[PDB]
């Protein structure tokens, strides 16, 4: 998911621009809902994920706020001790304590019904349990107790006015996100918001701990703790789900890492290419973000230097000089099927046969295959997320650093030999793959373009829309699920606000019972897919001047 | 009027809603929902509390075993029954106003019932303010800002160990996981400010 929002020192014709990408996947219907709310205090418009009480994109004419996934780790796991006799019970600070527990039934449909048991101790559900070492472990988040009020912090937030008391509800909203705001005269913030754990000295977060006492937490860290920026001396903030701020720790996961090779420059770089920016140019950032080969810029200056002795004949070399004109850029071609260069295709296969040589080559298996993949992985039907740089790509990038990273490189990843002749190995590899497919004349390399898929089936794998709802874009775009943009005082309208979205397929999923379409069932679609937008209306002269139908019910509780 | 509720759509059929106090606003924001999303908010409430098997069947199981086990049913309820009067009503007028439209579409079912409804086989049931609680708890906070790998760290690093040794296994896993990096880029700069705390990275806790 990513986020850019421009100030008053880096915006052109307004004083603040915030662009949103959440990246949640694509589905048919849309992941998110549009809707504005007008009475009680509220006066918002934007769209928000499952129609949510709370609104997590939009604005209320004075301010506008957005999210990313901020992923701190709020969340270790407590290795619980049990009792062969005594089942039932974990040894807590010196007594032998029962656990929570409860039945449930699955029925199912044409099937026999399923009852198990959920298990729950001090430190939460548990997870799994050894028998063995008689061990069971219990995931403890920070958050727990606190969903119910990040439910509510994220829709009273809608009605702040200024950074105070947005900031009020943001140190409510107990989950690992990004948030941020923009506002009328130009101020911009961030914020890393949520509950973190405050750790006993010598806990290390990314490994269990003993449940039986000594290792609780000690409470939660302040709101003070959180990282936060109101009005950044560079003019804007920028995410892409990368470290909020220098020496925070990220989620445990062996698949995340915060490193030097992190996609977020892809969009510092634009933004810091122009003094001052205009609205269309803000927008235009998604565009080139979108089709953007993520591992180029990382590895070119490695291909660059090793090949840089090698003669005009060999194929090596010439794999390198085609990479050297390329600015990077994915672009179709008129088949709309592959790509016009095949940049992509070659880092692709020369970062797989690097990565086998390097780093999965220093770790035992069955741990090894948890760093071979390239970034490049997809299927038929395209990614179903957002394309990153892998983890075994980040390792990789650090060990091709050298003494610059500050990483201590504990094993040697090229194993006594020197890198170039890793690099020239790899890029034989590469050779001998594509020529074979292709053939060796590299400026008729036609290779095939990742297409995007709305799926019928959302994110858990469940229906939500029968399969032939399924709809196809043939060109894969690397950007939010939805769009927004907020305009904050224009130099070209009278309205202090100007806002836009675009929420694919459509506003509506119904089809009634004949198979008759809804008229906002795909209106949205091809507007998508040309990087197009529609206006966001807030005042009453705006709603009502782009009227289309009106309901009026009359209800008493 | 405080009993009036006034539905207006743009030309994209994006809703507004017009509403004087708490408790009719969101039950217009649930009424237009169910409008729009009724199966999509059927399978997603099915999704989030584990009940997608009763409608269909065996292979939604392990799926339905999996969703229980991770939340607490209980705990999540008596955090609805402490809200106040004015926060209850936004859970409570959004269940309410998604009722009002159901009672509508399994009275008059052959023009209002969402076809997928009767593809899938079954109808629409009424929703409490827990459903409307738990869409948002089950795709976002238990599914988004649950992510942890600790168990499958500690496999690894027992591995390096066996491999390196103790002291260089720690120093492998430090190489691979590392806490923190310092050239990471970030998106609030250094001359504005560096997070405080300090960890443990060596696994001490053993
Ligand atoms: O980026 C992700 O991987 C998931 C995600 C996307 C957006 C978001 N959000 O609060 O906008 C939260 C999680
Ligand atoms: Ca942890």
Avoid: C
């Avoid at chain 1, 100030?7 to 809902?33: C, L």
């Avoid at chain 1, 939009?58 to 706020?65: D, E, M, R």
């Avoid at chain 1, 090894?368 to 299927?379: F, H, N, P, Q, R």
Wanted: charged residues 20%.
């Amino acid at each position: 998911s990513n986020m850019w929002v421009i100030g008053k020192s880096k915006a052109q014709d307004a004083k603040a621009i915030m662009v949103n990408g959440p990246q949640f996947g694509w589905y048919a219907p849309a992941y998110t809902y549009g809707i504005g709310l007008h009475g009680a205090g509220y006066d918002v418009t934007g769209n928000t994920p499952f129609a949510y009480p709370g609104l997590v994109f939009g604005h209320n004419g004075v301010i506008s706020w957005g999210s990313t996934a901020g992923f701190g780790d709020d969340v270790d796991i407590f290795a619980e001790r049990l009792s062969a006799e005594k089942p039932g019970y974990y040894l807590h600070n010196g007594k032998w304590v029962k656990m929570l527990s409860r039945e449930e039934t699955i029925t199912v449909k044409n099937g026999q019904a399923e009852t198990f048991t959920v298990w729950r101790t001090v430190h939460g559900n548990i997870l799994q349990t050894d028998q063995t070492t008689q061990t069971a472990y219990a995931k403890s988040r920070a958050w727990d107790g606190k969903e119910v009020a990040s439910l509510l912090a994220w829709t009273h937030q809608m009605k702040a006015k200024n950074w105070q008391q947005w900031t009020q509800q943001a140190a409510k909203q107990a989950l690992t996100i990004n948030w941020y705001y923009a506002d009328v005269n130009g101020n911009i913030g961030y914020v890393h918001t949520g509950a973190y754990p405050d750790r006993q000295s010598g806990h290390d977060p990314r490994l269990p701990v003993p449940g039986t006492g000594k290792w609780d937490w000690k409470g939660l860290l302040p709101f003070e703790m959180n990282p936060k920026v109101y009005n950044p001396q560079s003019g804007y903030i920028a995410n892409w789900n990368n470290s909020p701020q220098k020496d925070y720790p990220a989620s445990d996961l062996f698949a995340f890492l915060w490193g030097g090779a992190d996609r977020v420059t892809e969009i510092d770089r634009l933004l810091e290419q122009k003094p001052r920016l205009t609205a269309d140019q803000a927008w235009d950032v998604i565009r080139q973000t979108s089709r953007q080969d993520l591992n180029l810029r990382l590895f070119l200056p490695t291909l660059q230097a090793a090949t840089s002795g090698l003669t005009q004949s060999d194929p090596r070399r010439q794999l390198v000089e085609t990479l050297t004109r390329w600015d990077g850029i994915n672009l179709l071609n008129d088949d709309g099927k592959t790509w016009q260069q095949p940049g992509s295709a070659i880092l692709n296969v020369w970062l797989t046969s690097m990565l086998k040589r390097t780093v999965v080559a220093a770790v035992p298996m069955p741990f090894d295959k948890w760093y071979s993949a390239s970034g490049y992985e997809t299927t038929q039907d395209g990614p179903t997320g957002s394309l990153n740089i892998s983890v075994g790509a980040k390792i990789l990038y650090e060990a091709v650093q050298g003494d610059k990273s500050p990483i201590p490189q504990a094993v040697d990843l090229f194993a006594g030999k020197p890198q170039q002749e890793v690099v020239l190995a790899a890029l034989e590899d590469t050779w001998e793959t594509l020529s074979k497919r292709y053939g060796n004349n590299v400026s008729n390399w036609k290779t095939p373009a990742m297409a995007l898929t709305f799926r019928a089936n959302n994110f858990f794998g469940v229906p939500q829309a029968a399969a032939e709802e399924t709809r196809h874009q043939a060109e894969y775009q690397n950007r939010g699920t939805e769009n927004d943009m907020i305009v904050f005082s224009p130099t070209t309208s009278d309205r202090p606000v100007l806002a836009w979205d675009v929420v694919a397929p459509g506003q509506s999923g119904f089809i009634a019972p004949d198979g008759t379409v809804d008229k906002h069932y795909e209106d949205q679609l091809k507007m998508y897919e040309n990087f197009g937008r529609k206006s966001l209306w807030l005042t009453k002269q705006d709603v009502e001047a782009h009227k289309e139908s009106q309901e009026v019910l009359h209800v008493q509780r | 009027s405080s009993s009036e509720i006034k539905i207006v759509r743009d030309e994209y059929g994006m809703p507004h809603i017009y509403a004087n106090d708490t408790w009719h606003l969101f039950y217009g924001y649930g009424y237009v929902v169910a409008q729009d999303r009724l199966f999509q908010m059927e399978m997603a409430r099915r999704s989030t509390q584990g009940t997608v098997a009763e409608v269909l069947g065996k292979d939604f199981v392990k799926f339905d075993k999996d969703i229980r086990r991770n939340y607490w049913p209980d705990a999540i309820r008596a955090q609805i029954a402490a809200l106040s009067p004015e926060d209850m009503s936004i859970l409570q007028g959004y269940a309410d106003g998604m009722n009002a439209w159901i009672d509508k579409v399994n009275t008059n079912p052959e023009t209002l019932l969402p076809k997928q409804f009767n593809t899938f086989g079954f109808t629409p049931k009424r929703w409490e303010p827990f459903d409307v609680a738990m869409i948002f708890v089950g795709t976002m906070a238990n599914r988004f800002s649950d992510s942890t790998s600790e168990i499958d760290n500690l496999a690894l690093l027992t591995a390096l160990k066996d491999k390196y040794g103790v002291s260089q296994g720690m120093a492998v896993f430090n190489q691979l996981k590392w806490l923190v990096n310092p050239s990471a880029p970030t998106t609030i700069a250094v001359q504005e400010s560096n997070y405080p705390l300090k960890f443990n990275q060596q696994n001490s806790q053993t």
